[PDB]
């Protein structure tokens, strides 16, 4: 394993003897991770990376039905819980009962607002985060019924209701503004085919203002480059077919710098710590950046791998981010939840599967049963559900008015 | 009026001033999914919220209730919205509300609604007088709270409060020179006040940054900052650069020195230079060292820079 090797130990943190609050914390994670790495040596077994797929399935399968009061804090993020669970199962190649999928469809219909979009639960004001989630859920199911839950004529009204003169959108009426709104609107509007000519007017320009001196993208122009916002920005530009509104060179140097030499997983910001959900937000940026670069006819691009260590990210996840009882997590010690479950898995799948036209170099770490279904690097739903949804809505006219 | 934590807290259903209203329960549908088992207390406040809201009862009791609804789930943006409506309608003392949101943010400094609610009040009041001091207190508990820095940039930008922020950035950079939020803030500030076009400023910056590098050579932020402030004019328009950095090869080396050199070389090539053939050889060797020995986590990127360095 790239990680359990002896030279990899030189990838340990160089403190410079000038220790700050950052060195300290980083060095702490590194030790807890080292332990996991050396887990094998101390115990005298041969290393066998395996994805506790059954344990994970039973966790997800239960949460799709009911959660403890520990989830009272995500009571305004219910379409998210459907998405995270229904996508983890989707990647684990697990089943979505013709009855459960309906209930999900029926529940989301209750979340949907008469003004368009979706709320965090029955009766909540529509918000772009839950709308993005509800739409991705409905597409993962992908049936006349699910698709039919989405009110496209109302969704455009709503999208237009949030649209800002400078190109940005609010997340909800009277709500905040940051790149998530741009990606959320772009993802749902494109999939459901409601993109008019002036919908995203000036949106690519605002998103390009979020790109700062680091090569990365921040929440709003002027802010620190962050991995979850950089994915929202890049993916939003890929949808709008405007990746080129950014300096892709520096964006590439920035994203690639985010992978932890010693841990293998990614960090959300320069000098922060690794975190499993970033296995998708950050690593997902390379496939996006492959297309982008090859699109401008780049020669130096690989025909088998992404521009990050696919091996190291799969070791990090398999070894360090898996919960014995099921579910994945931030890093060792951290508790499990459906968000990290949905994102460590999405990142594993990004890491295991490459593409480049007709090239297909999958890399599956450990037990080959560890390979996951594929996921689309823009929507983060199976590439088939994406294709299936867009075309179905494509036979509907954009809500012209 | 009555704490959710008080030993003598009573359910809204058991309340005398809340009997004329019927608690509207959540409708998750005959066959629930991702259904949360709320506590009797969580369900109680919310059944009453659904009703007051549903009635659009813009009352004082409704006001006091959102407070409890917010404490049970501060991330409930719908309740936060109805509360702003009550703020306007009931014509509430906003400064008194500034104090409320101040305490709530201290509690959940990573909540999106609380920061936005605060921003709405400051706008209503057109008063940014408490901001930099409040933020600095939050950044004192977590020097990298994204919401705190973002809110900070808004107060400075909008109210044009730039004068003492570089002094603040310097303070925090003294506390943790690896604080990327501060390196970014320093750029936000300089680039919005004087800019980096001023030779004296540019020099002062590169000097200071070359210092932080020749002090904590493996601190990436200082490297991405120095690169950031120069790369926007051409690293190759700075002859002395390659030298001073080359001087740090054995005294302050990290794969950052090598990566920066690979970046200068790239620009001495874009701009064409004598010895370019050797330059390209030196640069590709560095790409192989970083790719094979010096920084293999990104061997895919480093060899790709080797291959692009071929074509262009």
């Amino acid at each position: 394993l790239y990680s359990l090797r002896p030279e990899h130990a030189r990838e340990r943190l160089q403190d410079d003897s000038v220790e700050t609050v950052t060195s300290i914390e980083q060095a702490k994670v590194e030790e807890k991770i080292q332990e996991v790495f050396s887990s094998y040596k101390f115990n005298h077994l041969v290393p066998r990376l395996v994805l506790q797929r059954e344990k994970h399935f039973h966790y997800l399968k239960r949460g799709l039905r009911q959660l403890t009061d520990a989830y009272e804090c995500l009571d305004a993020s219910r379409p998210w819980l459907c998405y995270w669970i229904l996508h983890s199962l989707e990647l684990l190649d697990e089943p979505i009962p013709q009855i459960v999928a309906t209930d999900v469809c029926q529940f989301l219909e209750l979340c949907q607002s008469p003004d368009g979009g979706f709320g965090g639960g029955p009766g909540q004001y529509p918000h772009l985060a839950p709308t993005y989630a509800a739409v991705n859920a409905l597409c993962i199911i992908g049936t006349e019924e699910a698709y039919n839950v989405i009110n496209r004529e109302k969704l455009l009204q709503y999208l237009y209701s949030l649209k800002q003169p400078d190109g940005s959108f609010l997340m909800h009426v009277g709500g905040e503004v940051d790149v998530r709104s741009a990606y959320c609107a772009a993802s749902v509007a494109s999939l459901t085919n409601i993109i008019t000519p002036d919908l995203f007017e000036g949106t690519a320009e605002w998103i390009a203002r979020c790109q700062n001196w680091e090569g990365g993208i921040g929440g709003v122009p002027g802010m620190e480059a962050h991995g979850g916002y950089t994915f929202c920005g890049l993916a939003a530009l890929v949808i709008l077919k405007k990746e080129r509104s950014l300096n892709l060179k520096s964006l590439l140097q920035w994203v690639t710098s985010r992978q932890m030499r010693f841990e293998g997983g990614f960090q959300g910001r320069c000098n922060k710590l690794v975190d499993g959900c970033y296995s998708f937000w950050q690593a997902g940026l390379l496939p996006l950046l492959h297309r982008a670069l090859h699109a401008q006819g780049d020669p130096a691009l690989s025909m088998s791998h992404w521009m990050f260590h696919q091996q190291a990210l799969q070791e990090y996840i398999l070894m360090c981010c898996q919960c014995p009882a099921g579910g994945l997590l931030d890093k060792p010690g951290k508790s499990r939840d459906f968000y990290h479950t949905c994102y460590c898995l999405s990142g594993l799948s990004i890491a295991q599967h490459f593409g480049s036209g007709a090239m297909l170099h999958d890399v599956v770490m450990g037990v080959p049963e560890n390979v996951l279904q594929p996921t689309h690097p823009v929507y983060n739903i199976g590439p088939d559900k994406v294709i299936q949804a867009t075309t179905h809505f494509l036979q509907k006219p954009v809500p012209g008015f | 009026f009555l704490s959710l934590d008080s030993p003598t807290y009573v359910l809204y259903r058991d309340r005398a001033e809340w009997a004329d209203i019927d608690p509207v329960p959540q409708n998750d549908g005959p066959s629930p999914v991702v259904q949360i088992i709320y506590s009797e207390k969580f369900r109680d406040v919310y059944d009453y919220f659904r009703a007051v809201l549903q009635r659009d009862e813009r009352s004082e009791r409704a006001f006091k209730l959102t407070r409890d609804a917010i404490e049970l789930n501060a991330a409930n943006y719908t309740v936060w919205h109805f509360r702003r409506v009550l703020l306007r309608s009931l014509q509430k003392d906003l400064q008194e509300e500034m104090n409320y949101i101040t305490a709530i943010i201290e509690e959940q400094p990573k909540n999106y609604q609380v920061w936005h609610h605060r921003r709405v009040l400051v706008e209503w009041l057109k008063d940014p007088s408490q901001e930099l001091e409040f933020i600095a207190d939050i950044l004192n508990q977590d020097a990298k709270n994204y919401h705190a820095w973002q809110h900070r940039q808004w107060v400075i930008q909008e109210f044009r409060l730039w004068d003492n922020e570089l002094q603040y950035v310097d303070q925090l950079l003294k506390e943790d020179v690896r604080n990327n939020s501060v390196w970014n803030q320093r750029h936000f500030v300089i680039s919005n006040t004087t800019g980096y076009s001023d030779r004296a400023v540019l020099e002062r910056e590169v000097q200071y940054t070359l210092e932080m590098i020749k002090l904590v050579p493996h601190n990436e932020s200082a490297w991405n900052y120095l690169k950031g402030i120069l790369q926007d004019r051409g690293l190759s328009r700075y002859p002395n650069l390659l030298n001073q950095l080359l001087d740090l090869q054995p005294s302050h080396s990290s794969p950052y020195l090598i990566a920066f050199l690979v970046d200068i070389y790239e620009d001495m090539l874009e701009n064409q230079c004598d010895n370019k053939e050797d330059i390209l050889n030196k640069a590709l060797e560095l790409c192989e060292i970083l790719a094979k020995e010096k920084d293999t986590i990104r061997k895919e990127y480093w060899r790709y820079i080797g291959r692009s360095l071929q074509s262009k």
Partner: peptide, 4 residues
């Protein structure tokens, strides 16, 4: 990680 709070994303909303």
């Amino acid at each position: 990680c709070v994303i909303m």
